[model samples]
Target chain A: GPHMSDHKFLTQAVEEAYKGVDCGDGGPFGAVIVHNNEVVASCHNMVLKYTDPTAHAQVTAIREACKKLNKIELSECEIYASCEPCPMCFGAIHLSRLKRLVYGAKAEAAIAIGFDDFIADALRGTGVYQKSSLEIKKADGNGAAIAEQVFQNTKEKFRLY
Target chain B: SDHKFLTQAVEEAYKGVDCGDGGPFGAVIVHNNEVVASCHNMVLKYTDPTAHAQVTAIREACKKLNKIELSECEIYASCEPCPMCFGAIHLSRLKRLVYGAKAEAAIAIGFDDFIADALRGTGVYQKSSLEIKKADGNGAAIAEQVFQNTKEKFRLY
Candidate 1:
């Protein structure tokens, strides 16, 4: 009971994780915003290079998609990310009113390593952000392991940022 | 000196009000006492809830400088920054944060200040790496006036 296209987009997000490591930019995270079965924007973690804390891959991709489409509604757009979003990006997704959110790695994987997601245990999987009915899904590929390895590769950048 | 910057931010808020922008809020990022970037709430223009004045100014300041670590920069916001913006500030590693009005004041004027509400009592303030303060006297009053004027102009504000 899986949509074939989910794997394709999640794979691309995994690739973005690889690119972020290879390019020495941001964290091992990466993301893409899609609409009409087409990728409108793709980005990697930019917090390190952009000197802006909110420049995470998910927020950057969403911002780029908004600019590319020239609309705020984000009506039918879906975001595919290498890992689950942090509180800021999660809050941002709620506000963007995106249609769906798909991811590869779990937030616990990032938390195991030196990151703080800032979402309490009680709020996990709750309808806290009830502004929209966003569908959430995870991919079954090695995307999580792959992205986690990128975190290992960029341990220094991960620690510094 | 700080009020000068916060006043400039308030001016931008007034400008946003006149232009029918998202909210009656503004922000300016300064480096070495020189204003580097100024922005107002652009939520409506950008259709992004993350497009607060603080984030907008931070975004442009980072873009304008072409670097991620804004170590020596200070940001002046028309209102106390919300949780998301505060997270951005924490991530940006900005040096200082000065604001005009309080979150309570913004809420009193009908702004949906829910996240800041959620983030309060979380020790997020003590956890941040920046120096934060509110402006003196007429700054907060003036900011309230700006919000008041804005609410009058845009009933939906």
Candidate 2:
């Protein structure tokens, strides 16, 4: 199920998250938070260069949107991350009251890059933030292709680990 | 070696880094900018229920010193703390934070969200009063033990 804007902005998240690869931290995850179909904030992982562990793309986008709007609960917003969020991001998502989560890469794919697949385990009956209304979607068909492209982009960098 | 206080703190970090259940972490608390209480991750020992080393140190200090507020104190860690620990640190109102590893270093491998969330003001966690300091070197001693005991079952962090 492709929202008209998903391709445009999720792709943007991929491009933005890649910008931090050389920092020698994280999987270069990118994310954009949207409210009422309007892009509120977009960011990529910048943990290494910034010495900030919570600098994941989803977190940055959520925090930015919260600050910009001066609100604590983003109940109407949708989060699109370049990768499936980790457990930490899930916690932030719940605390912020985000409505939906759309992600490009699978948790296993992300773990291949050295990330811990805490989210996947949780969703399978072993994790955090088990929300009933939170919608989870995986880009399929052409959309999945775009996600695949984003994951492929990081293959060469895995050797540095 | 020249930093007598940091050296002892690093030594304390060794005690908790090999939890065999979770990532290794160590911490030291400096009272009024002078080293006082020191501890490592106690989540494995069943003494403390959290995976964070800083939490263990602060709790221990509060218990032994008979106080809850950690004003005029600095906490040094073997690695950057997770969001939960950061929240604890802020609630304690520690004066400063010193750490050996970059925040990204832990995230690069596999860790939780950073304290930056609180710093930026999100949810119930308010802004922290602790100053941040990044140490020049990292936790080589702790990292070595972690590598050697890699076969040990690690805790789910």
Candidate 3:
């Protein structure tokens, strides 16, 4: 009841991530930024070259929102990622100071797919910004199944860790 | 080049690493696994997202070889592809895509969104004509380098 609209948008975002299954071996991760029940922006993983690695859906959507709104901070916005964010994206969420973080899959699922939570380590090392801890939760339903299809359709590449 | 040549492509990718923050990607276009053209990410200076290593390699091969399509070509990338490069591969009709790390690695750092949006939003390139492969012993060092370098600067922990 609390996040009903967010669930709909997250479902849309998850499907959006599915459209982005171009990584050959990794991902179909998608993310959406919502402000006031309006979908501000949405994106999927963006990786091209070694120099150009993965671009998390959450960060991209937020950046697009920032660019579009011309505001540096997205204080009241909520992010819905098809899969759990890695440490890097998690840190970005904290740094961006969003209101909430929701995902279909778990971090362990991403870890199995070659993602390591290095940001968790960073978070453990520093005791700063505890106040900025946003409401991180899971979305309702089997969105993980959608993300699993992403891995299944793509090839199995080298793991990041 | 076999797997050995993949290593060379990986070396080329290391050259494109303009910063520890973003990736340093390189890609080689091969016809029947024979290298035809090679390129690295030119986004460091140009800020052109289309200048990704694989995109650059494909464009360069097409321009140099005087061919509009890459029906017989395979792409060896130092890393995986974003959505835009995936679209280019579909449009160019490359035969295969050979890559290194997963997209998760790149997404950990940079700002790449257009690829996913284009693929998901438009549904134009859902099923690619090109075969995708995950290669070994290529661009691993540089991939690690990007992590270390960025970690040093940003202090992720």
Q: Against the true structure, whose DockQ is highest?
A: 1
Q: lDDT by residue for model 1 over A80-154, one digit each (tens)?
A: 988877656766776677888888777777766777645421124432322324687766656556655655566
Model 1 lDDT tens row, B32-115 = 889889999898777666798988998899888887768889999998887567667766778998888878777787765444
In angstroms, how far off is A58's CA in candidate 1?
Answer: 0.9
Best by lDDT: 1
For residue B125, model 1's alpha carbon misses the true position, in angstroms, by 12
Give the Å shift of residue A90 in candidate 3: 1.2
lDDT of 2 by residue, A38-116 (tens): 8888888755444344456776677688777666568888888887776456556655678888887776666665554
- Model 2 complex DockQ against the native: 0.04
Best by TM-score: 1
> Residues A97-153, candidate 3, lDDT per residue (tens digit)?
578887777656665555543223222223221222468776555554664545445
Per-residue lDDT over B61-113 for candidate 2, one digit per residue giving the tens place of the 0 to 100 score:
76656556668778877666665466556546678877766555555545443
Contacts from the true interface found in each model, as a fraction, amount to: 0.32, 0.00, 0.00
Per-structure clash totals for the candidates: 2, 8, 12
TM per prediction: 0.79, 0.50, 0.44
Cα displacement (Å) at residue B41, model 1: 2.3
Candidates' chain B TM-scores in the order shown: 0.90, 0.72, 0.75
